């Protein structure tokens, strides 16, 4: 089961940009992946000071390292134990969902489909697959396999819906239209397209004080999608 950490491009503007469209030219990657979490490490004021203070010292008298070690003792499961536990639960029991939980999730997914369609009436640029539903399922069974129980419960899923909801919230988050033209080029410039190619828009947008790589592609991908 693949766990992947991608690196996004250009920073915060990629959030200003459509949430997808990040990986290569294709969102399909993000479609295959169940749980996508673009993140923030907003240090609760005690974090940045945590790391800083840690850098300041980092010498004597191993007090901090010790503190880490008692954090390890107390730090819940010794994590050497956690492993053995995971093996245990993984081999022993295979969970199964309950019917009311099922119908619950039906309501879940149809509300998702409907509502977010309505959201996309405006052609709001972003998604929903039954694969995502199947994901939600696998989370429910996973967590059911935490409690080790042979059977699922409703509350048990009630967590999962909202967790994945946070994931959906993650799915949600030279002027473009001007460069988005290329249209003037596609027309009265080149019905063929040839001898035009990215190289042409390069000579057309090379000494016009104007075009970035992402800019050139964006407007291109845009018009490609737009249907112009």
């Amino acid at each position: 089961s693949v766990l992947a950490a991608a690196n996004p491009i250009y920073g915060r503007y990629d959030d200003l940009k459509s949430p997808g469209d990040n990986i290569d030219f294709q969102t399909t990657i993000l479609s295959r992946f169940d749980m996508i979490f673009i993140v923030k490490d907003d240090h609760n004021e005690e974090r940045d000071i945590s790391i800083a203070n840690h850098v300041i010292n980092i010498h004597t008298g191993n007090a901090n390292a010790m503190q880490n070690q008692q954090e390890e003792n107390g730090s819940e499961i010794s994590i050497e134990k956690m492993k053995r536990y995971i093996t245990y639960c993984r081999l022993k029991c295979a969970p199964r969902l309950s019917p009311q939980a099922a119908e619950k999730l039906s309501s879940n997914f149809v509300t998702i489909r409907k509502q977010l369609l309505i959201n996309e009436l405006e052609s709001t640029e972003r998604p929903i697959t039954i694969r995502q539903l199947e994901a939600i399922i696998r989370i429910t069974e996973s967590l059911a396999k935490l409690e080790l129980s042979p059977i699922a419960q409703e509350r048990h899923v009630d967590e999962a819906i909202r967790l994945f909801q946070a994931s959906t919230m993650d799915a949600a988050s030279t002027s473009l239209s001007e460069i988005r033209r290329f249209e003037q080029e596609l027309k009265r410039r080149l019905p063929i397209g040839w001898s035009t190619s990215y190289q042409t828009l390069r000579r057309e947008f090379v000494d016009t004080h104007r075009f970035s790589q992402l800019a050139l592609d964006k407007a291109l991908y845009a018009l490609e999608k737009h249907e112009t």
């Binding site: 090379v206 000494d207 016009t208």
Partner: protein, 249 residues
Amino acid sequence: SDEINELKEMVKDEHIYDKLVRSIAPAVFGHEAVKKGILLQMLGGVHKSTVEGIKLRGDINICVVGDPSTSKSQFLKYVVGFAPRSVYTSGKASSAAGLTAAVVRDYTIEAGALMLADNGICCIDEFDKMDISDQVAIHEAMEQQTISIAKAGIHATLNARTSILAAANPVGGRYNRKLSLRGNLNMTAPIMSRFDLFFVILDDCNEKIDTELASHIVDLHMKRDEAIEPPFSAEQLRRYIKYARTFKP
């Protein structure tokens, strides 16, 4: 002694500037810009000091651009004709060095092309034809001011301090008025920014000027009248200039 009187007679007058300008290139008709553009290369700056340190420039550069048939080449031929220590190449066929030294192997050094014209005006047609390879070398000449030469043998450094007059045809041989000149000339940025300044010419139809061209050209191809003459003779203008070179303004 007998001539210095003439030199004095030249410096006295208030018009001899204008005389210079009008008398430069008889063959060529008008434009008045590239006249000054050509002469002001012959007479260069202090090209000296400021130490500690790195030395200022000094000299000058020009690249004439325009739709062909504009006789941009006549200037060139006139410069290789008029001034001593002037090399003329048509490169594209430079081919490479060419503008630099071989070196001959020994360790005897070829002249050659660019460097054999030193403290002078080198005239190259068509920068746009020589592609990447040599243009970089020229940049090395107009940036570092020195020509460093090491080939399979004795390492070397040979100075060339020169002015470079080029004639470069536009991408489509035309304007493209609406396009930025930056995009039109089609030579790389660093060599572009070292040429100050371009003196672009485009020729457009004006019946007065048209009539004047046909008249003037037919005139040229007539053995008579060849009586068209500059206020300064081509011979004296040299001793004049060479005099004007001895000043440290």
